[PDB]
Amino acid sequence: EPYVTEAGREAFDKLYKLHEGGLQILSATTLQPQLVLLEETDLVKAVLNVLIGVVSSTFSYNQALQSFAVKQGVYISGTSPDNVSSLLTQVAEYGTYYTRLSHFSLLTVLDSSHSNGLVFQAFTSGLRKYLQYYRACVLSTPASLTLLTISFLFRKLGRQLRYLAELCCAFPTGVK
């Protein structure tokens, strides 16, 4: 017989609105928070877009920190409200250290800078081969029909990217 569990996900979404409503009163300024659309399909197209340096509607580039920013308020995430809102942040962070790595490649020029190593420039010529490779993995990430196949894959990668980015963004150069 239908219970909350047996009814569905949509029942949970109606209830989630209701449960919220009590707490929204005091988070209210003079009115309470309201719901904002994204469909289930809008998320699975967005997850691939943060990971190539591009914004979609969900993703807001912030140019005073060089990091991506998701909508901080309540977004209804189809029938999975506000759990995805937290899940979409860990993969948002993974594309950020990707735009910090891509920013770092451009820095090095030997136009008249000679304190920028020759070795330091060769370090970037191997670094950029590592950046096109990421892009080719995001091009093979399709198809994405759950947010899970995308998050669990990058349990391996998420740790890797923190090492590989933030060793240099200190600033060693040359023989050092």
């Binding site: 909350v4 999975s80 899970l148 740790r159 923190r162």
Partner: protein, 151 residues
């Protein structure tokens, strides 16, 4: 309810699956329309999301006390999460297939990880409380595997 619970157990809090850093991930007490009995089995599933984020901080803290068998022990700890995260994903495709499901089905599928996870949680706390590192890491996991429970 069913699919939204899967995200609570890969360590992502709603305000329904609230995370407390004392007693863990817990279901909020007597929320509207949740059977007395279903909150009890939803709480046994939340202990497998509590020890799962108590395990993913233990990787990220020591990768990317000090030691170089500690971080070999972290890639030792990521391998037991490997079948867990596949069984969260095999629940995931079932609950996209139709939306009527019982939580007894997740209870049935993830009890297997309710007897690997407590028995490994004593391992990482024992590492951090005698402050031990090194080649005595290899000794620390070995004599527990001498112990009961085939899994």
């Amino acid at each position: 309810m069913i699919h939204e619970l899967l995200l609570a157990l890969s360590g992502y809090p709603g305000s329904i699956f609230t995370w407390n850093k004392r007693t863990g991930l817990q279901v909020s007490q007597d929320i509207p329309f949740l059977h007395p009995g279903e909150t009890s089995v939803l709480n046994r599933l939340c202990k497998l999301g509590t020890d799962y984020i108590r395990f993913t901080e233990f990787i990220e803290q020591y990768t990317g006390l000090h030691g170089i068998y500690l971080r070999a022990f972290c890639r030792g700890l990521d391998s037991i999460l490997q079948p867990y995260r596949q069984a969260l994903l095999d629940l995931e495709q079932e609950f996209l297939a139709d939306p009527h499901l019982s939580i007894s089905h997740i209870n049935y599928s993830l009890d297997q990880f309710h007897l690997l996870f407590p028995s490994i949680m004593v391992v990482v706390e024992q590492i951090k409380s005698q402050k031990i590192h090194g080649c005595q890491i290899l000794e620390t996991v070995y004599k527990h595997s001498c112990g009961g429970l085939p899994p």
